[PDB]
RNA sequence: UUUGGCACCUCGAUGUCGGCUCAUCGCAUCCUGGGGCUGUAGUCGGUCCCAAGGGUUGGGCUGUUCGCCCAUUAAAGCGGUACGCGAGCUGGGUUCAGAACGUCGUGAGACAGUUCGGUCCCUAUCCGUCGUGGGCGUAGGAAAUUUGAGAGGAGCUGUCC
RNA sequence: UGGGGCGGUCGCCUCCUAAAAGGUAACGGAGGCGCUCAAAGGUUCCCUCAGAAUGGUUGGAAAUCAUUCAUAGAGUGUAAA
RNA sequence: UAAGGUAGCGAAAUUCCUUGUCGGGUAAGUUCCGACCCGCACGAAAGGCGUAACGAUUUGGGCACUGUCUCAACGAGAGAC
RNA sequence: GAUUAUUGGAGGUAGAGCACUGUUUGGACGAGGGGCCGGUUACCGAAUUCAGACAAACUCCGAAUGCCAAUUAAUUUAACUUGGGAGUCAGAACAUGGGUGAUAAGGUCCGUGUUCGAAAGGGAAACAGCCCAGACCACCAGCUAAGGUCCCAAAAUAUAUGUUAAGUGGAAAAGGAUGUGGCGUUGCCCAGACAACUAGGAUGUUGGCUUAGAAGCAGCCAUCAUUUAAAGAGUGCGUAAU
């Protein structure tokens, strides 16, 4: 529950407007709303802003770090990208790649099939230099977050979804 | 019910009262008992029998007065003022 | 190592925190902190 | 939900262990189901959690409570309900009077140590449950079709490709 | 008689339960009794502690004896007071 | 002590240890048969052992047979209504 | 006769307390026995002190309160004797004290109070013993008690203050959060508390025992200075050395 060395949220070239108790990422890169808070009353002077701290409660100051770090997320990643570098490994089971698309001889009764996102940059290197570019942490961190959950790198042999920062490991292999 | 077997201790004496049957201040008859003890816990002085048993007994007729006796003990010293 | 009652990390960076709500300690210690009389 | 202790209700009677037929509620779950987790690569074994929705053999051997076994099964659960239910069934058993043995008792006789045999009443008045109709009413009357407030029932599995 | 039950016990005295007067229960706790002293009694005139160490023929330290303190710890016919 | 059970039958209408022991039989035998005796409490005229025949006698096993039963269905009837 | 101010006395409770009796000596203490030849030293019997702790059947001490009686005082209204006629002997629950049982029991036995029995009414939802409280009869009058005041249901959505977030309220024990305040400290402490963002967080040299070789876990450390804003013969999670 510590968290508030960082509570600047200052905007960018991308307009951080409202839309009532919504907010609009707008400018170069934008026109995403999404509601801040109620009583975190947000405000930009010209090009700076924080989220205002009204009596700090347990809640209303809570939820300023909510509001400055989504809005931190939000200006982050609509206007630069929430780009997330991943990996992938699928070994005997023929998991294989279909461009935007993907398919496993699992090898089931029906071999079973992938898919690609909406709106969020698969973009593939090498086929396993893959970045995941988006929005914000919420969702689309939570879909860098899961990605790796897809098909983790299962241990005793090592084929799963990795981030490129992740490793394999090992199980006493014993039946 | 079951066995329940011998069993003893349930042995005690039908009791005697003792102690005092009259007080501080109170008038007497000749006969009269003043004190049920055993052994001597207060000492008759004046005009005071004491029969067998460590009773006593006011020789007259009067009233009491109870007081130290030693240093440290107690007797009666009975006076028929009137 | 061998598995306890537990596992045994003890480490104290202790995170205690809610993911959007859930709380819960991104640490090593969860042997001390319960409900408490 | 053990063995007990207290002696309140019931001795002008609340009258029977079991089993049969029916059930019916729980969960502290046996199967299935899911997840996580291990001295789990999955399985494994095991573990923790979610889980009660349902389901949970047939024979042999003891009145015996009981357990043991033979074959299956996904399993072959634990409990609660006057030790679920006898004004629904049997009574095997125990308790009746006979008789036998062993032991004890001078003996009458007792034990329990066993064994054989030995009588289970009721025309349902009320509530209640299964159904069946009658009555009346639904601001006009009759025929037919109807919405559904809600209520009930339904959901087990395993196998081959 | 915490069902009858087998067991036990059933009459007196001391204490504790008993609650600072006395008094009082329990198949409640502990103990004595079913006598004895013609001297342990009566009455005059004396004595006064065991015990302890002190310690020494003794010595199983100690007996008997002896120095000094000992609370009646002595002891008092019969339990406890 | 007056003396100590002889044959014998034995885990038996009687075994506490105890389904003592161990097969046979059943796929499975808390029994049944058989056998071992470790006979609590075994023993011979309120008799011991074995016997053909006998038995509305007890108990185990088998064959037939079959709605006893799985697994219940129909009919006829007396009741019922 | 009673109640109480005034008495005066008896007495050994509770509590205290070891002073006896003694319950478990921590320590020493010196010896005896003893290991040894009659000795050594251990420890004791025991006692020496110091030293504490404990007590239904221990007491040097010792209440409150109750018992008895006084020109006892005052305010009440009893009190006693005689004799006629009776019923009661299974009591129950609460508070309380005690025993017994299992610091079990809506148990069981005594005791001190109270109620029922023999007593309605109100309150406790209903609720013989709990709380308030006794009815002679009326009465469409009033005042209050226990308890209560948003609806059923009469009364304040009253004031003013607070705490708490659980429907607690309107489920218990131990165990274990700060989950929160508070109350005071704490060591801080504006330089700047205390978790955290993070700065750099490395060696001659594991040196000694180096244990499976092991150079922060299945292990003992002689544990020498810093490279140096802040820092270690390495704070912190590996049981394969790293």
Redesign the interface.
């Given at each position: 529950?510590?968290?508030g060395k960082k509570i600047i949220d200052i905007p960018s070239d991308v307009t951080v407007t409202f839309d009532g108790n919504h907010v609009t990422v707008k400018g170069p890169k934008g026109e995403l709303s999404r509601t801040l808070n109620e009583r975190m009353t947000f405000k930009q002077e010209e090009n700076t802003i924080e989220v205002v701290r009204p009596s700090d409660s347990k809640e209303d100051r809570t939820n300023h770090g909510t509001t400055r770090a989504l809005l931190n997320n939000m200006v982050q990643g609509v206007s630069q990208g929430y780009v997330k570098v991943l990996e992938l490994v699928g070994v005997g089971y023929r998991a294989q790649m279909q461009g935007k698309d993907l398919i496993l001889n699992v090898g089931y009764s029906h071999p079973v099939e992938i898919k690609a996102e909406e709106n969020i940059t698969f973009s593939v290197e090498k086929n396993t230099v893959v970045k995941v570019e988006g929005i914000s942490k919420?969702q689309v961190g939570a879909l860098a977050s899961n990605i790796r959950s897809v098909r983790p790198p299962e241990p005793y042999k090592g084929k799963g979804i990795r981030y490129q920062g992740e490793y394999v490991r090992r199980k006493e292999g014993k039946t | 019910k079951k066995g329940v077997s011998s069993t003893k201790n349930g042995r005690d004496s039908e009791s005697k009262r003792l102690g005092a049957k009259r007080a501080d201040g109170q008038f007497v008859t000749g006969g009269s008992i003043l004190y049920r003890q055993r052994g001597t816990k207060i000492y008759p002085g004046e005009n005071v029998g004491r029969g067998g048993d460590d009773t006593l007994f006011a020789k007259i007729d009067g009233v009491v007065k109870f007081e130290r006796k030693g240093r440290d003990k107690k007797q009666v010293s009975v006076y028929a003022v009137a | 190592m061998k598995v306890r009652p537990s596992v045994k990390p003890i480490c104290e960076k202790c995170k205690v925190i809610k993911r959007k709500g859930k709380v819960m300690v991104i640490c090593e210690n969860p042997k001390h902190k319960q409900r408490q009389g």
């Open positions: 529950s510590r968290v919420e | - | -």
